[PDB]
Amino acid sequence: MEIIRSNFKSNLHKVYQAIEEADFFAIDGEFSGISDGPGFDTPEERYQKLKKHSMDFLLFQFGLCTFKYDYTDSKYITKSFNFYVFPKPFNRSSPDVKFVCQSSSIDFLASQGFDFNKVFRNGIPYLNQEEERQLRPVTIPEDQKKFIDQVVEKIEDLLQSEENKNLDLEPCTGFQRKLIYQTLSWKYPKGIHVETLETEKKERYIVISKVDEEERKRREQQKHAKEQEELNDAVGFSRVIHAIANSGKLVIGHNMLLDVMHTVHQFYCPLPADLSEFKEMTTCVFPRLLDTKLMASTQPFKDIINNTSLAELEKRLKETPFNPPKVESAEGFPSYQLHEAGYDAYITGLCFISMANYLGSFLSPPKIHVSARSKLIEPFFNKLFLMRVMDI
Amino acid sequence: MEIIRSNFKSNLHKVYQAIEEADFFAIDGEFSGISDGFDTPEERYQKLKKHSMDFLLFQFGLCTFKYDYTDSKYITKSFNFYVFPKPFNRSSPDVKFVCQSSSIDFLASQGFDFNKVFRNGIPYLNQEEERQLREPVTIPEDQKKFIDQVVEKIEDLLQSEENKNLDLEPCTGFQRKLIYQTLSWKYPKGIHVETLETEKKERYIVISKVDEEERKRREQQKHAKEQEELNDAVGFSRVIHAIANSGKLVIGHNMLLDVMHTVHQFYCPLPADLSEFKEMTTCVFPRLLDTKLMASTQPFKDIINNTSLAELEKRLKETPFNPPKVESAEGFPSYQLHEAGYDAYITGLCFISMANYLGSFLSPPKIHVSARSKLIEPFFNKLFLMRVMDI
């Protein structure tokens, strides 16, 4: 499903439900670009370069593929989503976000059909952890006497007459508007609510209305209600990420450092000054990670896999000894060939599954199916590649 | 019209033609952003250069105006060109540009199609980047009968009519060598050896046809497609060159960033001095006018209290101004949401309303003032940097 601004909240339950039911998810990103210019680096030194020359780019498509096993059918049911995100400034005090684009990146996505209007014209907005807290006496001159008598006389033809009527006065001058407001403050102190509405242009007509004192409070706790909505909306796609973090479920990627860096930098909190505290901060968002590149680089998979690119991986993992897992999408959900985050997460998940069930081939007796909760898969958890294999 | 990469070449004749027939042009840019007090023009120029030219101008709006003395009316053609840098292989620069969220959102609210920029935008090259991209026979016994049956198939086609193709069934790289390596002796002219691939990547050999007959009937189309591809990469800069080489008046509104961006992308990366910039600006826009400045100067300053394009296009219809009698040229679209072309088009009508008014001070007062009139010269070649600046 193509989830965008106008259909995000409308789909949020479906996503939540997908996340809650899932045995594991698979994720991917699509970026504005990679680097704005530029071997013996240390992880911390490298981390520092990435933070400087890659974080000014944008993750503007988040691909999430849910995977739920069905032990009756022995098959996985999937649900892939593509979320288009864009930092659409909420208030008039919000930061005006500047980001960078790499022409060859835009060009490649363009070559795959990426719809930039889905990001730039109608992208789901978002806020990070901090941007959320942050965001949380009476004289009437002789020449107006009849004018005001008339108005009071109408207001008495309102307090009596039946129907929840609205008396709306025909346009008058600012002076007369002042004399009217003042005259109603000592003549109808409670039970009447005055307003200055606009027909086409320049607020010139007044609306007087019979307004209960209990209904002043209805409209207020109704206005406050829509206010907590506007806020809780603007956190936007970060709600999805929150839901994944809290799920506790295994999150799968392929060559996923920038996926993760970008995810946490835009939806959680701006990347901290140090690799060490970044690892911690990462165990917040993604307490249970697995990269499929490294898994397909580590034994017993190293012994048979020569290219660990996502592309070659999914080619390889259909042939012996690996079996392509039986998979199908949820009724109602789309199916699958050009590149997009959603599909890449999907392909990523098939790779994982296919490797996982392979580990099971070495048991006695051999298990055709291995869980993501299996402990055979735990050795491959929380290892990311900076300048070498790195624990998280 | 709406002009994009897959649409540009075919319409280039209309664009060059509107440019030649015009009395003057109106241009407007649309950027991916605007920016990431007692400054001097140079100090500011410097600051503008660093903090603004890393944004893209990705839509160029051109509107030509040509007066009809007969029908007493202006006739207009207007264009949006969508422009992105990308083209020509690995040796080419990979541009990194910036985007401002506030600018992008506003353009979104007006129906701007970002796919026309990013998915099918007209490429381009500045002066320098263009200038730059413009610079034996021992056959082993076990293969004897294989090569000989190959020498046959080619002979039984060489002196024979219905001359279409010869497709050798797939062979081993060693034989594939030997076939090539033998036709070096046997048939040194007359034939074209070539290892193609089936849609399934498998290597075929082909001899097919002739030598010295289409050895330059196709080498002509090869080099005419080499020079063709090159001058498609220069792309939109050709229209900027066409405009510059014309001399004609180029009208803008609050144009400093339009001009700056135009020459930075389609001519040459802005130089270090403000004074060097003023020189380049004359190459590209020898004759230029800013409706906002014109409107902020007598005899208009005494009558107009707001020189913004929206408020100006309203005031220039009211007395003592007369909206210009105007019409789209036969075959072109007519005119509202914001866009380069329309902002240009409006910029043109503001200029004309103002120019004609100048004529009312004559005796006899003329109702129509030409773009070449002497009354207009005092407003020419003036931009606002931090004060009114001559160019």
UniProtKB/Swiss-Prot annotation, chain A:
Keywords for the protein's UniProt record, in alphabetical order: Acetylation, Cytoplasm, Disease variant, Dyskeratosis congenita, Exonuclease, Hydrolase, Magnesium, Metal-binding, Nonsense-mediated mRNA decay, Nuclease, Nucleus, Phosphoprotein, RNA-binding
Residue numbers marked as site, Interaction with poly(A): 293
Gene Ontology MF term list: 3'-5'-RNA exonuclease activity; cation binding; metal ion binding; mRNA 3'-UTR binding; nuclease activity; poly(A)-specific ribonuclease activity; protein kinase binding; RNA binding
Tissue spec: Ubiquitous.
EC identifiers of the protein: 3.1.13.4
Co-factor binding comment: Divalent metal cations. Mg(2+) is the most probable.
Keyword Transit peptide among UniProt keywords: no
Reaction catalyzed: Exonucleolytic cleavage of poly(A) to 5'-AMP
Resulting phenotype, residue 293 to A: Reduced affinity for poly(A). Little effect on activity
Signal peptide boundaries: none
Cellular compartments annotated: Nucleus; Cytoplasm; Nucleus, Nucleolus
Mutation effect (residue 116 to A): Loss of dimerization. Loss of activity
Chain ranges of the R3H domain: 145-212
Post-translational modification comment from the UniProt entry: Phosphorylation by MAPKAPK2, preventing GADD45A mRNA degradation after genotoxic stress.
Keyword Nucleus: yes
Disease named in the record: Dyskeratosis congenita, autosomal recessive, 6: A form of dyskeratosis congenita, a rare multisystem disorder caused by defective telomere maintenance. It is characterized by progressive bone marrow failure, and the clinical triad of reticulated skin hyperpigmentation, nail dystrophy, and mucosal leukoplakia. Common but variable features include premature graying, aplastic anemia, low platelets, osteoporosis, pulmonary fibrosis, and liver fibrosis among others. Early mortality is often associated with bone marrow failure, infections, fatal pulmonary complications, or malignancy.
Reported function: 3'-exoribonuclease that has a preference for poly(A) tails of mRNAs, thereby efficiently degrading poly(A) tails. Exonucleolytic degradation of the poly(A) tail is often the first step in the decay of eukaryotic mRNAs and is also used to silence certain maternal mRNAs translationally during oocyte maturation and early embryonic development. Interacts with both the 3'-end poly(A) tail and the 5'-end cap structure during degradation, the interaction with the cap structure being required for an efficient degradation of poly(A) tails.
Subunit-level organization: Homodimer. Found in a mRNA decay complex with RENT1, RENT2 and RENT3B. Interacts with KHSRP. Interacts with CELF1/CUGBP1. Interacts with ZC3HAV1 in an RNA-independent manner. Interacts with DHX36.
Full protein name: Poly(A)-specific ribonuclease PARN
Organism encoding this protein: Homo sapiens (Human)
Curated annotation (Swiss-Prot), chain B:
Key words, A-Z: Acetylation, Cytoplasm, Disease variant, Dyskeratosis congenita, Exonuclease, Hydrolase, Magnesium, Metal-binding, Nonsense-mediated mRNA decay, Nuclease, Nucleus, Phosphoprotein, RNA-binding
Positions bearing N6-acetyllysine: 186
Catalysed conversion reaction: Exonucleolytic cleavage of poly(A) to 5'-AMP
Tissue expression profile of the protein: Ubiquitous.
Listed cofactors: Mg(2+)
Broad class of enzyme this protein falls into: hydrolase
Residues that coordinate or bind a divalent metal cation: 28, 30, 258, 343
GO MF assignments: 3'-5'-RNA exonuclease activity; cation binding; metal ion binding; mRNA 3'-UTR binding; nuclease activity; poly(A)-specific ribonuclease activity; protein kinase binding; RNA binding
Keyword presence, Heme: no
Localization terms from the record: Nucleus; Cytoplasm; Nucleus, Nucleolus
Keyword RNA-binding applies: yes
GO CC terms of this entry: cytoplasm; cytosol; glutamatergic synapse; nuclear speck; nucleolus; nucleus; postsynapse
Phenotype upon changing residue 343 to A: Loss of function but does not abolish ability to bind RNA. Induces a decrease in degradation of mRNAs containing AREs
Modification note: Phosphorylation by MAPKAPK2, preventing GADD45A mRNA degradation after genotoxic stress.
Described purpose of this protein according to its UniProt entry: 3'-exoribonuclease that has a preference for poly(A) tails of mRNAs, thereby efficiently degrading poly(A) tails. Exonucleolytic degradation of the poly(A) tail is often the first step in the decay of eukaryotic mRNAs and is also used to silence certain maternal mRNAs translationally during oocyte maturation and early embryonic development. Interacts with both the 3'-end poly(A) tail and the 5'-end cap structure during degradation, the interaction with the cap structure being required for an efficient degradation of poly(A) tails.
Subunit: Homodimer. Found in a mRNA decay complex with RENT1, RENT2 and RENT3B. Interacts with KHSRP. Interacts with CELF1/CUGBP1. Interacts with ZC3HAV1 in an RNA-independent manner. Interacts with DHX36.
UniProt protein name: Poly(A)-specific ribonuclease PARN
Organism listed in the record: Homo sapiens
Lineage: Eukaryota, Metazoa, Chordata, Craniata, Vertebrata
